[PDB]
Homo-oligomer: A and B are copies of this chain.
Amino acid sequence: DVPQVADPEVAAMVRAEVEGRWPLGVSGLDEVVRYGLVPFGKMMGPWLLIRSALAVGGDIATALPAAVALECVQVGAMMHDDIIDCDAQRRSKPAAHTVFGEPTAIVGGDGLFFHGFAALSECREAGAPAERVAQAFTVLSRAGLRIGSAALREIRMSREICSVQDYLDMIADKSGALLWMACGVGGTLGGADEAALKALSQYSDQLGIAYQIRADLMAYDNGRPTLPVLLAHERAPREQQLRIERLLADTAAPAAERYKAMADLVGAYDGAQAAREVSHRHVQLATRALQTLPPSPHRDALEDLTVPGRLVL
């Protein structure tokens, strides 16, 4: 009932730390590093890492440099993904390669990666036992391999019908691994036992799937297939399924007429609502996994992240 552990101000404390490390006016490699970091934004990843560490009894001083590490790793990956990405959102800020040139944007992503690795190395001096610091690097690295594999698969799997599970596995690596990178490393430094880490893993995967579905739904309120498209295909009769596959199969058709053809078929078979119910089931599975963790304001914070509109990546 009553909180027996505290609830700190995670969001602003992170921003102060990253700004302290790369303040306004930095030059050299830190200038391109800072460009990827600013505007700071919500930083739900670093927020999730510290909350996961505190949910298992960890230290703020230990989890804080790991939260900085993750931001640098994710921004470095995002800086490199922008180079290979083609369609840009109007809201999305100008890509670093468009601003600094493509060669500089690659070096910048590398500086972001190694600044992350350097920040995670500071956890030893922060108080974490060297056995835990090394396990944090292992959890972080494997998550970094799933997000990179998904980015390549996003490029390859597009414009073709895939199995519903094949989409689910990819979005678990694109979105669930972003959270598992936060929850796994945060829980590890926090001293979570083996059962707690698996729960945070289940929470990360289930919430990552749900977030992606919610993103797939925004066009249904890049011309790539999404879960509402797959669910509509599964429900559509054979004649319509034939159409859905050839629409995806050939990368030589105008974008507008492609989109409207997909949007009409999704609406005809309630693909949007079906995607909502799938997302809803995985949200409840994420909250179920949380119950393994001990009750705390931090565990309440992770469950609040499952509320629609609260999580933003």
A147 within 8 Å of B (CB atoms): yes
A278 within 8 Å of B (CB atoms): no
Given A84-B102, A102-B83, A144-B113, A152 and B118 contact (CB-CB distance below 8 Å) = no
A66 within 8 Å of B (CB atoms): no
In the bound complex, what is the Cα–Cα distance between A82 and B121 (angstroms)?
Answer: 29
On whether the beta carbons of A118 and B147 are closer than 8 Å, the reply is no
A282 within 8 Å of B (CB atoms): no
In the bound complex, what is the Cα–Cα distance between A111 and B113 (angstroms)?
Answer: 11
On whether the beta carbons of A110 and B77 are closer than 8 Å, the reply is yes
On whether the beta carbons of B152 and A137 are closer than 8 Å, the reply is no
Given A102-B84, A103-B84, A106-B80, A121 and B148 contact (CB-CB distance below 8 Å) = no
Chain B proximity mask over A294-311: 1 for CB below 8 Å, otherwise 0? 000000000000000000
Given A137-B121, A155-B103, A147 and B110 contact (CB-CB distance below 8 Å) = yes
Chain B proximity mask over A111-143: 1 for CB below 8 Å, otherwise 0? 101110110111010000111011101101110
Q: Which residues of B contact A254 (CB under 8 A)?
A: none
Number of this chain's copies in the assembly equals 2
Q: Which residues of B contact A83 (CB under 8 A)?
A: 102-103, 106
Q: Which of B104, B107, B108, B109 is close to A110, meaning CB atoms less than 8 Å apart?
A: B109
Per DSSP, are chain A's interface residues mostly helix, strand or loop, or mixed? helix
On whether the beta carbons of B148 and A114 are closer than 8 Å, the reply is yes
- Chain B nearest CB from A132 CB (Å) reads 8
In the bound complex, what is the Cα–Cα distance between A137 and B131 (angstroms)?
Answer: 12
In the bound complex, what is the Cα–Cα distance between A66 and B140 (angstroms)?
Answer: 17
On whether the beta carbons of B110 and A84 are closer than 8 Å, the reply is no
The 4 A-B pairs of least Cβ separation, nearest first, read A118-B141, A114-B144, A117-B141, A130-B134
Binding site for B on A (CB under 8 A): 28-29, 32, 76-77, 80, 83-84, 101-104, 106-111, 113-115, 117-118, 120-122, 124, 129-131, 133-135, 137-138, 140-142, 144-145, 147-149, 151-152, 155
A-B contact list, 18 entries, CB within 8 Å = A28-B152, A29-B148, A83-B102, A83-B103, A84-B102, A111-B145, A111-B149, A111-B152, A113-B117, A114-B140, A114-B148, A117-B117, A117-B137, A117-B140, A118-B145, A121-B137, A130-B131, A133-B137
